[PDB]
Structure 1
């Protein structure tokens, strides 16, 4: 891979002349997919899509003589009819259908487009790392098998083993990639209400997800007892069983707690693991670095502390699970407990 540093027609310099075409893709999706650069529903869905495209790869299966999926190869978009019907991928055909036209129009590979839209999406959320974007994913030729994407009702062991198989990720890295639930909502677990967020700041990439999953769950936000859902600590917020148990397991509880009040570790770890996900099934040395096309991320506005307890909660409500270090003493926002507002998805989610 020979790279040719170049100045694009917009006047910006990039690592390789082939990267210049992505500035037109960027302007199109910022206006027509993310409604003016928002960290809203489509941005969240695009971030989710990166993981469901990428994690569908299995060296264990390949060792048994069976196709195990191609990783970040755009298969979930190319074969959407097959893959979006898998239960772990519930609700993803909506975002795939919204993304499809941009791929056809710009003549980029589905896989590179999914990794691009995920990185741009995150750049729209205040607090996000400065994201990378590498090109080079050839179109998938076979859909991924089912049973590769984790479900919210899988055990901690099941999920640890799944991500270890897919990309040799350890239990620490599992925790890091779950940071993406800091900018996310749930549309399909509670059938009575769509758009319940995982943390109280679904438009900000912060550590509230790690704080709020550690509080005692006291109620369901909509209907009770749905598969993969557990009680949450705040009105309007949802908690799934996998996140709840990873936060409390002796292998991963101290790593989960380490992001509380530690913005630089959150950002650095997530930057790293997001890039790794987007390279599953690929040879990093055969890819082109087009990270200079991705916009600069913005800081979190205002002057509140980086991490805090939501109003109405104090250290007494934390279920301490990390045996090595006490949960940090955070401030509590003033006033009455307030409900987290839902994020309505586009039709079909």
Structure 2
């Protein structure tokens, strides 16, 4: 089909996404950049979607975290999420798409601004949210690996899929874990969707980027990078260590698994055959140009190898 401004898309009902695309690129993402607003919106897809539990309820990726922000932003694990919810809410009021659709579309559009990124499959037609997510369904940085895995497993994700999803931390920073150093990134290239995150969380901790007493935080390997205790443990846990390391210097796998796994997550509580495929509306991301690497002056001896079957790959530094 061909839309009114001449732009084309496979299914005619996708046409209404183009003015939304233009709006968000200029006014949410501040000129199509891969900065803070993109990182925030990506976090929002997870905080929306993961409110889904067979035994307690929640409609998953349904927009409840906007529609019922009053409740859901009261959950400790949604600390800091109010900012991006209030940034997004006007877009949803102004345009004609459900909140569920908007959160997933903006996350996918955002990720497409990042070098190395992918086009997350996007589907249109999520009905408005009809209930608030139950409490206590969003994992935190102080939870154990077993607890994180059991929660994600409860929402339909296996341990390897939890790992793939965590490629999102390749474009990420924390504001609340250590409020004295807000905006400190999880890897050295928070504007680049690459494997530096899986490499750098594997280094021995050296120091604390700000204060030392912070719940959910591990020693970082670098002044200038912050490390979650959960990422620290996942990178070293016998259940997840090998999959973690298999992401290193493996951008084709990170791309493939992240797009597919985000797609599954974007559809929690939803049925894609009742929805319209509008994937081709997401922009084409820039490619990487620079090789994966250890930070300069670090070597293999700085790496806490945790995969018994496969030694950590020999990267340049």
Asked if Structure 1 and Structure 2 have the same fold, meaning a TM-score greater than 0.5 normalized by the shorter chain, the answer is yes
* Aligned counterparts, 1:152-167, within 5 A: 152-166=141-155
Map of 1:18 onto structure 2: 13
Map of 2:199 onto structure 1: 211
- Compute the displacement of 1:12 (Å): 2.7
The 2-side partners of 1:130 and 1:120 are apart by 8
* Aligned counterparts, 1:63-74, within 5 A: 68-74=57-63
- Compute the displacement of 1:17 (Å): 1.3
Query: What is the Cα-based RMSD across aligned positions, in Å?
Result: 0.9
The 2-side partners of 1:22 and 1:133 are apart by 11
Stretches of structure 1 lacking an aligned partner (at least 5 in a row): 1-5, 62-67, 333-349
- Compute the displacement of 1:128 (Å): 0.5
- Compute the displacement of 1:214 (Å): 0.2
Aligned 8 A contact 1:130 1:297 in 2: yes
Task: Confirm or deny that 1:256 pairs with 2:256.
Answer: no
2:269 is paired with a residue of what secondary structure?
Answer: coil
Task: Confirm or deny that 1:117 pairs with 2:102.
Answer: no
- Structure 1 stretches of 4+ moved >6 Å: none
Aligned 8 A contact 1:126 1:204 in 2: yes
Map of 1:196 onto structure 2: 184
Aligned 8 A contact 1:200 1:237 in 2: yes
* Aligned counterparts, 1:264-279, within 5 A: 264-279=252-267
- Compute the displacement of 1:7 (Å): 1.0
- Compute the displacement of 1:60 (Å): 2.7
Give TM-score, length-normalised by structure 2.
Answer: 0.98
The 2-side partners of 1:192 and 1:298 are apart by 33
2:215 is paired with a residue of what secondary structure?
Answer: coil
* Aligned counterparts, 1:14-93, within 5 A: 14-61=9-56, 68-93=57-82
Map of 1:181 onto structure 2: 169
1:265 is paired with a residue of what secondary structure?
Answer: helix
The 1-side partners of 2:55 and 2:316 are apart by 46
Task: Confirm or deny that 1:317 pairs with 2:305.
Answer: no
1:153 is paired with a residue of what secondary structure?
Answer: coil
- Compute the displacement of 1:191 (Å): 2.0
Aligned length: 317
From 195, 220, 225, the equivalent of 1:237 is 225
2:129 is paired with a residue of what secondary structure?
Answer: coil
- Compute the displacement of 1:164 (Å): 1.0
- Compute the displacement of 1:13 (Å): 2.4
- Compute the displacement of 1:162 (Å): 0.5
1:248 is paired with a residue of what secondary structure?
Answer: coil
The 1-side partners of 2:200 and 2:64 are apart by 34
